[PDB]
């Protein structure tokens, strides 16, 4: 549709704006609508209440944490929304082979705006751990040893291997320099989630293979 054109436009914006990416007033209005209608018209009243609840929670969070005073409240909402089941419609929205949805793109712009709007003191510096069920070819197409991966996905990780951890077929150990800690905004803060936007670059240093789980363990380092 025109969604294809919107996707490539957004991917171009992501790389051109870099850390200056910022959502516009209407982009936030569109994100609000996308989130409230995401399950269809029958759940709009419930998801309008969820939205209003998240707005008030994030409005008060800015009151309690003045360093967040100039983050759009909707952008913060985007970060809590990311930690719900809604992440499934936006995590891959900018992948080359993904079929974009209007709601996916709306979500994406405000999550990206949030991540580059958070003050640097929210960056986690150190190793963050990720597990996902992905196929070997999926890994090979995206990560090769001693090559740089320009990630087009929203890449989730954790400061820890905590109770949230569960062994998966693919694992990452990613040295973070500016990956942002969003536990303060998540519905489950004790996961200590760290989230990288599309456009993050990783120097892949080595990829381990096992016939056990993890089948593939990727070691990579974020770079400027």
Residue numbers in the entry: 73 to 296
Study authors write:
XopAI, encoded by XAC3230 in Xac, is a putative type III effector composed of 296 amino acids. XopAI resembles a bent right hand, and it can be dissected as a two-lobe structure with an N-terminal α-helical lobe (residues 74 to 193), and a C-terminal β-sandwich lobe (residues 194 to 296). XopAI possesses a highly negatively charged surface at its central cleft, whereas a positively charged surface is required for interacting electrostatically with the negatively charged phosphate group of NAD+ in mARTs. From analyses of the crystal packing, we found that XopAI uses an altered mART domain to bind its own N-terminal peptide containing a conserved Arg residue.
To study the influence of this N-terminal region on the crystallization of XopAI, we produced an N-terminal-truncated protein, XopAI-ΔN70 (by deleting the first 70 residues) and grew the crystals. The crystals belong to space group P21, and they diffract with a resolution of 2.26 Å. The structure of XopAI-ΔN70 was solved via molecular replacement. In XopAI-ΔN70 crystals, the asymmetric unit contains four copies of the protein. However, we did not observe a thread-like and tandem protein packing in XopAI-ΔN70 crystals. This result suggests that the intermolecular association of the central cleft and the N-terminal sequence is responsible for the observed tandem packing in the crystals of the full-length XopAI protein. More interestingly, the coordinates of the central cleft in the XopAI-ΔN70 crystals show that these residues still have similar sidechain conformations in the absence of the Arg peptide. The loop structure found in the P41212 peptide-bound state is in a stretched conformation, whereas that in the monomer D of the ΔN70 crystal structure is in a contracted conformation. For example, the central cleft in the P41212 peptide-bound state has a volume of 722 Å3; however, that in the monomer D of the ΔN70 crystal structure has a volume of 159 Å3. When mapping these structures onto the energy landscape, we found that three monomers share a similar PN loop structure near well C, whereas the other one has a distinct loop structure near well E. Unlike apo structures, the peptide-bound structures constitute a discontinuous energy landscape.
